[PDB]
Amino acid sequence: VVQPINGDPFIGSLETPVTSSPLIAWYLSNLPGYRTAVNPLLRGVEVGLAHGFFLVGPFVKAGPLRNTAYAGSAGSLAAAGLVVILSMCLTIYGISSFKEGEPSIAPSLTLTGRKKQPDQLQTADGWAKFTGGFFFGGISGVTWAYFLLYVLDLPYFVK
Amino acid sequence: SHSVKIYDTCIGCTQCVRACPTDVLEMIPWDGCKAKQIASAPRTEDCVGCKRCESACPTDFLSVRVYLWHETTRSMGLAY
Amino acid sequence: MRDLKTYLSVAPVLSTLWFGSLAGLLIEINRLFPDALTFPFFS
Amino acid sequence: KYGDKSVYFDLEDLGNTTGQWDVYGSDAPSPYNPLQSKFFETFAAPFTKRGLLLKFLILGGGSLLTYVSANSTGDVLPIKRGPQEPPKLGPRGKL
Amino acid sequence: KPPPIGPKRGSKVKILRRESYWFKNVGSVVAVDQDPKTRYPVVVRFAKVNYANISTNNYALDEVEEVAA
Amino acid sequence: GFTPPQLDPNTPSPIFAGSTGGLLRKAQVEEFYVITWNSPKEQIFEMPTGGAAIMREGPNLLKLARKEQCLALGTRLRSKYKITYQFYRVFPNGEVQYLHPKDGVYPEKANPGREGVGLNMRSIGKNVSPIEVKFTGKQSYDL
Amino acid sequence: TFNNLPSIFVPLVGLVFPAIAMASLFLHIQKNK
Amino acid sequence: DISGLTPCKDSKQFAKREKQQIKKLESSLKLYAPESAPALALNAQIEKTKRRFDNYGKYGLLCGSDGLPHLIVNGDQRHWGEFITPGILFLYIAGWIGWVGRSYLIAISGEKKPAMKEIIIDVPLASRIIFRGFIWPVAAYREFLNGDLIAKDV
Amino acid sequence: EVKILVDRDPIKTSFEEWAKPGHFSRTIAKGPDTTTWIWNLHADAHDFDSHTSDLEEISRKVFSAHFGQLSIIFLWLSGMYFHGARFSNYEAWLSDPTHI
């Protein structure tokens, strides 16, 4: 089912099973990157929580102090630092890409041709709310990963 | 963008513009040669700078001449 | 043949002939007169 | 019209022509619980001013970095532990 | 004038044009456009090509000078 | 005021199974250079975005990426298939600028009705040195 | 404290001054008036 | 004895180089029979080495502290066999090459398509010229006086 | 269906084209105005798809060129086997191959 995007052959993409399928499109459409209708703050919270855990993963066990007793604590600290930096670069991104009050640069159309509402994430205040959610969610996910490594160390692998 | 210029040594052979892939050039009438035509460059905004025009100018050095200048999205030849 | 000699006179064929003759010359000189650093005749 | 037989240049609907599509941008409503959403709103609205967020991030991160590197001892980083070893005399005496 | 204005067809000529490949080099006039409105009538034919593999070019009357030979 | 633009209508597009060399976000915020041509038969041609397309019998329409794409296509059309072509420029606001002949005639036939610009009435060596135009916007070649 | 000043200034300089500098310079790049 | 260099006929390290190379070639000589081709070739190389060292001794070469002949180029009459006599021997041949080539290019210059004579070398013409560079130091001098060596701009 | 379709005396054996270098191409078979010509004489030497447009002459050219390559490899193996025969220690290497 490799017919082009929206059946439009002169747009540079295709509706292959990987892009446009009932399972993978649904998955890419019901996650906080593409929830264009809900406010960007909850989206950013979800995103930051997930990436905070994903970053605390390869800092405790993989790192300069992984074998020491300071593995979990200092690794979570480095993960929170990387999260602060990611919110930092997200912030300069929101400042540089769109200024203060312009309308959303997101597409106001869908595959079915409906003149949907534009994604307010791409606005200034919207991206700022998204960055705030990302920072809050990321620090929270870092400390929760630290908590789970603390109180529930035995089921997880140490190696 | 780029500044294409046609000097008065042109013989009006229409190779500069038949080689130009971006419609930058066009032949106009003139009274300076046996062919009674000379090339002009109105659409320099569409000039990428490929110098196919001056790789086909059969003169002492050149008559058409491309000067590299402020590069925009269309002079840089970007589809994005 | 005129054209065979025209080809033998071409630059690579004549170059390899000339440098084979020359190389044989210098080779036989460095075999008959080996290990030469100074010109001793009327030295 | 964009929906005609192999017509992709609806000059009025330039979004469908140029490819402006939310390819996966579902406009479905908030699937989160309202109470936790309000909780996150009230607890992350401080991070709403991107400029204040950036100033806070840079300054507090630099402060925490200096604090960690100044209060950390040599047990967590060998550079602050010091030599704890006699110095080798270099070549030619020491020069 | 209706009579010839420039060098003769075959007159070996020198190029005073500083931007040409054959500057300070001799040539061979093959034609002279007798129209009294063209700017570079003197069609020369040189012996060695330029960088564009071209042996001929139009020159003016003041950008050309015949040799004593 | 002798040749009017053509104002391309909603014509059909060639049969093509879709590629990746098509229209990116440049079209969504800048021009994208529609081309229109008129085929005698349903024949097959190489697309400038890579891949083979099947042009339709009658008028066609292609919105590819940029000027060089449509002009390369049109040159291949005119030389290989001997077919009249004309292409445009479609800004995202809506305007459609006509560009390829701009006189109904291709830009090789020196047809009167076009004003000569980019025209320095001198040989190329008689341009002034840069010091003569130092600290001036004119670089070397606009006097 | 003199032995503790590199521990304050090197993490300060080589990480924050890149943060400040690269951020402010990216903002200066991506600007419009 | 100039430049702090002892001659090779009265040098110690030069004879030491000789002895060391001879012992090296003799160590590779006790692996074959003394009448077979390898041993005969090794003995020939040995005599070649010994005569080489003795010839460098008898020519008055100057061997430094490292024990190798250091050639003198300054112009000392004793050491014109080092640079100046072979230098003249070179320049005579090199100018032969240049002069026959130049007279060849001038010979084909009055051709319809001269370049084909640079590809397809006219061997009769060159062979009639190939010995004309024997007298290059006088023909070139006259072409310089007559004005035929250097071209005129026009 | 399959056959031995083969035509006789298509090309003449003659040194006439040896004397005219660059004969195979149009721009090269007129003379060296420049030195690049000789580089184009070797570059396009085996570019038979550019010399002609029909695949028949190209196929014949590459077939006989493969024959020349096989001649070269047979001559190379001749050299190797010969040098083994005359200028080698193979007759001695069989005795003590782990040390010779």
Ligand code: CLA
């Ligand atoms: C030039 C200045 C500079 C300085 C001072 C540091 C300092 C450090 N680096 Mg290095 N690094 C640098 C440049 C620098 N980096 C560059 C240019 C690169 C790329 C080549 C790296 C790549 C690198 C890697 C790959 C790793 C380090 C690691 C480390 C830590 C030492 C490991 C250890 O034993 O302590 C152990 C100390 C800890 C586990 C605690 C970490 C403290 C965190 C980061 C402070 C959080 C503060 C704040 C919230 C975020 C920063 C704010 C921002 C404005 C700067 C230390 C914090 C290691 C590390 O720990 O990083 C995770 C490590 O794995 N660095």
Ligand code: CLA
């Ligand atoms: C440019 C640098 C350079 C220089 C100056 C030399 C110089 C020399 N090398 Mg070295 N060499 C070099 C580069 C150089 N080489 C390179 C790059 C390589 C690697 C390819 C070698 C490899 C090499 C080896 C392996 C050997 C040398 C040898 C020699 C010596 C040659 C003596 C000889 O046989 O000539 C004698 C003269 C001739 C061959 C020319 C004869 C010319 C004919 C007869 C015409 C002249 C007569 C004519 C009719 C005019 C007469 C007068 C009258 C009629 C008018 C000499 C010291 C050999 C040697 O003995 O080392 C000391 C030696 O074994 N060289």
Ligand code: CLA
């Ligand atoms: C010896 C007799 C002979 C003669 C007189 C001819 C004459 C001719 N042949 Mg024929 N040919 C011959 C033998 C001969 N051929 C053989 C034995 C083969 C099989 C390989 C061919 C295969 C052949 C083909 C496929 C073609 C010709 C063509 C031609 C014509 C032009 C050839 C030319 O100018 O290039 C002269 C080229 C050379 C003199 C050199 C060629 C290279 C040789 C074969 C091998 C080089 C080996 C060498 C050691 C490798 C390099 C390494 C080195 C650096 C150490 C001409 C009519 C062409 C023709 O008519 O098309 C218009 C053509 O297409 N010939």
Ligand code: CLA
């Ligand atoms: C089955 C093997 C095979 C065959 C039949 C061909 C045949 C051809 N190739 Mg292909 N090719 C091959 C292998 C092969 N090639 C390999 C292995 C490579 C990787 C490098 C290439 C890369 C390649 C490119 C990039 C191009 C070709 C081209 C060509 C065509 C013309 C070549 C020509 O005229 O040069 C004739 C022969 C020469 C010019 C001599 C080459 C000189 C070599 C590099 C000398 C140095 C190598 C040597 C071993 C080192 C010793 C040095 C010593 C002499 C001092 C011809 C159709 C060209 C083409 O079709 O143009 C349109 C082209 O552009 N080939």
Ligand code: CLA
């Ligand atoms: C049993 C039949 C047979 C055999 C043995 C071969 C063998 C070979 N063919 Mg093939 N060929 C055959 C049938 C056969 N062919 C048929 C029926 C056709 C027509 C469709 C072709 C068309 C064909 C083309 C177009 C080409 C080959 C090539 C080759 C050579 C490839 C290089 C190689 O591996 O060298 C290994 C070398 C050997 C095995 C040495 C064998 C020496 C004998 C004498 C020649 C092969 C037997 C020969 C077919 C008999 C013909 C009768 C003759 C005695 C009068 C190889 C010699 C290629 C080649 O190299 O060109 C020269 C090539 O370009 N052949």
Ligand SMILES: CC1=C(/C=C/C(C)=C/C=C/C(C)=C\C=C\C=C(C)\C=C\C=C(C)\C=C\C2=C(C)CCCC2(C)C)C(C)(C)CCC1
């Ligand atoms: C003695 C000596 C020395 C020194 C020397 C010197 C210093 C010299 C100089 C010299 C010089 C200072 C020179 C100059 C010259 C110049 C010129 C100017 C020339 C010219 C020439 C010509 C032109 C030629 C030509 C030719 C010929 C003849 C050959 C071949 C051909 C030709 C044609 C190439 C020493 C001690 C070191 C060592 C020993 C020896």
Ligand code: SF4
């Ligand atoms: S290529 Fe040069 S000479 Fe020919 S028409 Fe164009 S400008 Fe004139």
